[PDB]
Symmetry: C3
């Protein structure tokens, strides 16, 4: 239903960073990208890319930058607003921001193709965002249905909601034919699913990607994968994109300008070639070969470190494990929430298993224990 | 609900081939197969096995061969008609053909257990085919419900439609208790899902096979896997069948008489044996080890080559990649449609990304570019 | 909605074993377990752990043991009753047993947090168990909703029923807000799905575990994996738990006191550590490396052996394959039902393929054939 039949790259940029020369600096730069460096879909991100205390200034920055530069951005612009299925205050905040951003007197809306809504739940929560899009349109004299809605699938409920989208979109009490991208959010989804891994890295969730690809094909939407947060792992990003393309998920989230270029080229067929034989800078194949398996103490450390960064006005940071090499991973509030699971489980167990207090004290030490019991 | 509780082999045969001694030659031969050589379910295929210009003659051939030989065919006969969820002309054509085929004056219908319907969409499209079966029955005085319907699951919508089949089949406004096999169609499904792989070979779609197996168990149907189009790869076909059987999908499509024999034997338990130790004709293990990774140019070539074969009256052909060995893959219209994805994406990108025209010209050459922009 | 936010271990114990000093012996012992040895959820099992002729005595044993010992059991107690979606007699039996067990005069109900229902089908079969819980509550003056219901997902229909649980639980004609655990039952599920493997071991069913984890997250329930029946394979159990935790399924069934300890420790984060490098008692790594691939004859043997054990008053047994090592697997009625698939398929084929009788006689011998044709 939308102009872009295929979307290779979905790139988010923080809308307002603190410390500050120009808080809009990341948007002004991403707005000047061109050719293979520029994304099919660019997402100024007022949600997890942006510290909370910074989001009001972020939405002004969005209006200001797209005002001045959006006219020749060559991809499509769809900013991410705040939303959450379980928070009416957050829904209202994302609606008020969209309403400000599309005021036609401000010159941004003419260059905005739609908005991206995170944390949606079942289909009746998607109809609530849809109704806000309709109200915004009517309040600002835009054509009905002209702002595309894209959603981030980052809960069990939203994953199930993709099952009946075709007939729910047909109901004439909604305008959900405006739906454009269905985008996985593996980080908050890991959180919602309560998953954990020995390294703390994201599970691969092949079934989620299968279901988001199916859902888009059945409903006329386009499926995009979520963030590959080991931002320096060029080879990993390529292998993930190839795995995605075999599920029919041909687009991927990009966190950096370097990911944009890789993800723009990856699904393009090759120049020539090429026969393969399948019988059977050192730093880079070394990081490819090492992993760390953090202790309960390590986990709390990563969280406090992130906590401090966010409180200082930074939404997203590259966090580092160093040895012997230097392993980098993009952290934000989602990453923080997801990392907490092994701790929430420990706490549940301590609270409810007084008979195990002694072995847990043997296993951790009474000091590590009392620290864990403090978090969140 | 049907006589065959288990179906190992679902074998399709083209119903009318051009060039021509006897256009029915493939059906007359498949109709004489016996023992391990004969399939549990034999499908004379008026759809993708058969060139379009040939399908009217194909449906006559179906009546003629089953008339003369169907009496002692030892498996069940279920011919595939044309259908498509998005084409009313195609639905009507498949219904008119079924109506001709079951005319009891012609002596074919007494040896036909049902029909196979390709390209179904959501459950309301399955009810449309069901209604045609009911009309055919009544028009020709067959008992209501006596023709089995089997469907090919080869879209995202049909995959989702298997979720509520039990209660939709119970509604008394339909006769969908006639449902027999739910059969995956990986080739058109790859197309519908927009998937792609570096070699052009089919993705494995484990979740599709999981869901078709689940759907059959929940609704009282029997699940069958789709075609394994590397028809000479005996070892690959065996490994796929073993992988299927572990999902509860115990039947598989067969494209050749040699696949019939393999697929008839594979799920039978062994004669004796057998302990395995898991610590760690040359041409055949060589093809097992090589793959080709085609260029944008290669892709267009395979398509034009197929295009020409179909236009000459051949629906299915073995296409060949040669090196140094000879790699064979069954091609039909589905294969053609599926192969086009990397091209449709390139075209989308060229059309919508004028700012990338220059790097794409560097990457391919202006000649390769203008060729790609021509396809389909 | 329930006190335990996380459940690591779900341990079943037979409620009545024949031969007999004290038929309650397994319950009395499991009831004395403490610390890391004691499960978060303990399941006295009146269903597949217990021979049928023994289940009336089993439900008395349940009342007697929990009466005397349940007060200081430190985990939660949820006994498994009999049930089946396709047997009204079995539903009624499980309800009469729950009604006996919760009589407040008998002193067991004060220490029971809920009951576990096996073999559920679609959501309307779950509402039938729910209604029995409500009747039991009212008949015995318990607070409405105070007995938790947990279900075992061990059919295709129940797997699909998890898709709409959130809104079905909201209907005020039911009390399904009492739902607590959604627990996979891989053994009966293998049966229901008709799956088979060359060794007879359980398929891994990653999608089932994905869907049960999703279903629990969407509906506010807790997801637990099914039994790991190679009870001596410590390393296998650990790898399965790690694979589960990456799907968000953080609990697992335990069949032995040794599994309880392993599964209690596995999802706890580590004491310290630990960097890994990924470039590349003998009996135990030997069993880790061998497998057996049974013949049609072998399969019947395992079944008759199990059949005899059950008829003698034993519900669960460790069955043994010996060579050269000793491979142990927990067998019960589910295992028996699941093992029969390769035989049911052979029988279907023999019955319906008279033209294959001769090759099947060549392949097996007329004696092996006539034996297979006798089973069940
Ligand atoms: C689950 C979720 O919600 S994920 C989506 C939310 N998170 C995000 O969007 C994170 C976005 N990305 C970022 O914030 C940054 O890339 C970081 C912090 C992760 C990494 O920072 P760096 O180490 O600078 O990355 P890198 O070295 O590739 O940067 C290259 C240049 O492009 C700039 N750049 C990096 N990422 C972006 C971006 N997302 N948008 C605009 N400009 C960017 C960098 O600032 C750097 O600028 P310079 O020219 O002043 O040096
Ligand atoms: C996604 C989909 O729609 S797939 C289902 C649609 N496609 C089909 O059904 C394709 C069916 N198969 C075929 O058309 C052919 O097998 C081909 C063209 C792919 C390969 O042809 P060949 O290379 O002959 O295969 P093969 O060497 O195994 O053939 C053995 C003999 O059996 C015949 N035979 C092969 N396939 C079939 C068939 N499907 N039905 C009847 N007879 C067949 C061959 O013609 C050959 O005959 P001969 O005795 O005159 O030599
Ligand atoms: C698909 C399904 O329905 S699966 C769930 C149904 N099946 C079951 O629950 C099977 C439960 N487990 C058992 O019956 C037994 O563990 C068996 C028969 C499989 C194995 O028996 P063993 O070889 O004794 O196991 P193991 O050596 O670990 O036993 C250690 C001790 O704990 C006891 N024990 C073992 N399992 C249990 C149990 N499930 N509950 C209580 N006590 C147990 C043993 O009897 C043994 O006792 P001892 O002190 O007298 O020697
Ligand atoms: Cl916002
Ligand atoms: Cl709310
Ligand atoms: Cl929903
Ligand atoms: Cl898509
Ligand atoms: Cl037809
Ligand atoms: Cl139509
Ligand atoms: Cl549907
Ligand atoms: Cl089946
Ligand atoms: Cl019972
Ligand atoms: Cl019933
Ligand atoms: Cl249901
Ligand atoms: Cl859970
Ligand atoms: K409308
Ligand atoms: K609508
Ligand atoms: K898709
Ligand atoms: K009817
Ligand atoms: K019906
Ligand atoms: K099945
Ligand atoms: K109620
Ligand atoms: K309710
Ligand atoms: K979960
Ligand atoms: Mg998120
Ligand atoms: Mg097809
Ligand atoms: Mg069971």
């Amino acid at each position: 239903r939308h102009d872009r039949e295929f979307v290779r790259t979905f790139f988010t940029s923080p809308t307002a960073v603190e410390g500050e020369d120009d808080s809009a600096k990341m948007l002004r730069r991403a707005a000047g990208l061109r050719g293979m460096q520029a994304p099919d879909v660019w997402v100024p991100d007022n949600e997890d890319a942006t510290a909370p205390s910074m989001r009001d200034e972020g939405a002004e920055n969005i209006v200001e930058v797209i005002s001045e530069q959006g006219a020749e951005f060559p991809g499509e612009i769809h900013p991410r607003m705040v939303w959450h299925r379980d928070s009416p205050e957050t829904r209202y905040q994302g609606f008020q921001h969209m309403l400000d951003i599309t005021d036609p007197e401000r010159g941004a809306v003419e260059h905005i193709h739609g908005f991206v809504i995170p944390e949606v739940g079942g289909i009746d929560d998607w109809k609530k965002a849809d109704e806000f899009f309709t109200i915004v349109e009517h309040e600002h004299g835009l054509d009905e249905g002209s702002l595309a809605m894209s959603v981030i699938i980052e809960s069990g409920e939203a994953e199930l909601a993709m099952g009946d989208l075709r007939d729910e979109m047909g109901k004439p009490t909604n305008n959900l034919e405006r739906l454009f991208l269905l985008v996985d959010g593996e980080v908050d989804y890991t959180k919602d699913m309560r998953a954990m891994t020995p390294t703390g890295e994201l599970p691969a969730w092949p079934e989620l990607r299968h279901n988001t690809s199916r859902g888009a094909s059945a409903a006329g939407c386009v499926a995009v994968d979520g963030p590959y947060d080991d931002i320096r792992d060029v080879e990993g990003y390529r292998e993930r994109m190839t795995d995605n393309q075999a599920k029919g998920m041909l687009g991927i989230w990009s966190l950096t300008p370097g990911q944009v270029v890789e993800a723009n080229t990856s699904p393009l067929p090759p120049k020539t070639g090429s026969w393969l034989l399948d019988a059977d800078e050192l730093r880079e194949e070394l990081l490819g070969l090492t992993s760390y398996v953090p202790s309960m103490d390590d986990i709390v450390d990563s969280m406090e470190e992130f906590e401090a960064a966010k409180e200082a006005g930074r939404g997203a940071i590259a966090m580092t494990q160093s040895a012997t090499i230097e392993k980098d991973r993009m952290w934000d509030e989602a990453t923080y929430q997801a990392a907490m699971t092994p701790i929430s489980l420990f706490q549940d167990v301590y609270e409810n298993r007084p008979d195990q207090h002694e072995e847990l004290e043997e296993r951790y030490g009474a000091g590590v224990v009392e620290r864990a019991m403090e978090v969140g």
